Ligand binder design. Structure first.
Ligand SMILES: Cc1cc2nc3c(=O)[nH]c(=O)nc-3n(C[C@H](O)[C@H](O)[C@H](O)COP(=O)(O)O)c2cc1C
Ligand SMILES: Cc1cc2nc3c(=O)[nH]c(=O)nc-3n(C[C@H](O)[C@H](O)[C@H](O)COP(=O)(O)O)c2cc1C
Ligand SMILES: [Cl-]
Ligand SMILES: [Cl-]
Lengths: 219, 219
């Protein structure tokens, strides 16, 4: 096993991977850890789709690219500068996931949080109800589950990168998954993906805020 | 220290606390761990306000109650039973934090995710851009931080409950904090609270989904 703080401070966004496998049994451990995460009213708004199928990983890449190109055709009319930065960004911060042996699609569902049905019952303005979602407790919950998964990967000798940069193409990703596998998402939609494998060594991360910057102790 | 899985499977929502203090040094270790969480584009959209001052904790409770009562007097006109369910809910799942020695207010700020500025650039429909936020990557990031805090609390001999049920009164909570401490939130807003202490014995958690239900291995 591995001690908690060790895993926490070891954690990086892994974007380069060794040519080694990740066992289904180890992935299942990661998922059990995710499943034990806290969630708003125990909604447990998560479902992990584990993909090792190369052609499916590549088909998902292709749909991201198709959607990205549709956006780029319009961006080029406004600012080739901005369009070109987007071209580089998707390459380096989305499609790098093909470098890993495992792609995990994390599906989720909307959690209507405390206050929502109470305010709806009394015909509160939508503007008031919307304020509950600026701090989206449903996505806090998803993040707790994905962080449990992430730390457990590290304990088991692996590492990962969390991804939401694909989500302008989420509908298209869901569609190809369904065509290729018959997976039925129901009310769920894509929340995040994880690129998962054995990390290369000597990976880099940006500096973080000093702990004293991110807190205030009231005296 | 404590091994990761041991911490993950020890974690419960702690709503009853022993009469014992939490050291500032230990709380700082929790926040340092929180600050190591991944976040979209390294935004680190979190600030932890640590409160031990009893009168401020009570003042926060009173604005939660006052806001609750404004909702209740309208709910009673539609459904007294539903209003009664909300009365019980707020006692059991919100105002119990007063039972702990420490209240942490977790402030956060909006993260405009990938796709946002690109779609804005090309005057994409607001309804399209809104879809990025149904999986709010900023709040996924916040959840990752608060989970790191949560697990660290357990390793150090404490426990906590995560709260978002107060957030129909978030603005009012922020106003009390500001009025009583001088804290300047700037662009940040209340995301969650944590009730933090040495946990009571015999804590109960609800039944969870079986792991087979929360994953799919594509074959
Ligand atoms: C973002 C989020 C918000 C939550 N808000 C509350 C809350 O306001 N009050 C409460 O009593 N529990 C709250 N919880 C705890 C959940 O009720 C709890 O995690 C769930 O019932 C599972 O129970 P367990 O944590 O003991 O395993 C919250 C959890 C999450 C992650
Ligand atoms: C919800 C969220 C979404 C993220 N999306 C992406 C992404 O699409 N592409 C990527 O390369 N990294 C992504 N990341 C990783 C962050 O860029 C990374 O956590 C941050 O830069 C800090 O680097 P570190 O994780 O190595 O410490 C995401 C992280 C979070 C938590
Ligand atoms: Cl993003
Ligand atoms: Cl809530």
């Amino acid at each position: 096993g591995m001690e908690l703080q060790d895993t926490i401070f070891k954690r990086q966004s892994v974007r380069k991977f060794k040519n080694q496998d990740v066992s289904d049994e180890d992935i299942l451990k990661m998922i059990k850890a995710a499943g034990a995460a806290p969630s708003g009213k125990n909604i447990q708004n998560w479902h992990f789709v584990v993909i090792k199928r190369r052609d499916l990983m590549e088909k998902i890449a292709d749909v991201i690219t198709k959607k990205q190109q549709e956006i780029l055709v319009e961006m080029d009319k406004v600012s080739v500068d901005k369009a070109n930065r987007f071209r580089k960004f998707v390459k380096n911060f989305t499609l790098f996931y093909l470098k890993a042996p495992v792609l995990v699609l994390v599906f989720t569902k909307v959690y209507n949080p405390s206050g929502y049905y109470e305010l709806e019952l009394i015909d509160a303005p939508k503007e008031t109800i919307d304020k509950l979602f600026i701090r989206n407790p449903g996505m806090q919950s998803l993040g707790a589950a994905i962080e449990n998964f992430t730390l457990s990967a590290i304990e088991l000798g692996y590492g990962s990168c969390w991804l939401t940069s694909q989500n302008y193409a989420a509908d298209e990703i869901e569609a190809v998954l369904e065509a290729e596998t018959g997976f039925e998402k129901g009310e769920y939609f894509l929340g995040a993906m994880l690129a998962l494998g054995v990390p290369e060594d000597n990976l880099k991360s940006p500096s973080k805020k000093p702990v004293e910057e991110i807190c205030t102790f009231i005296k």
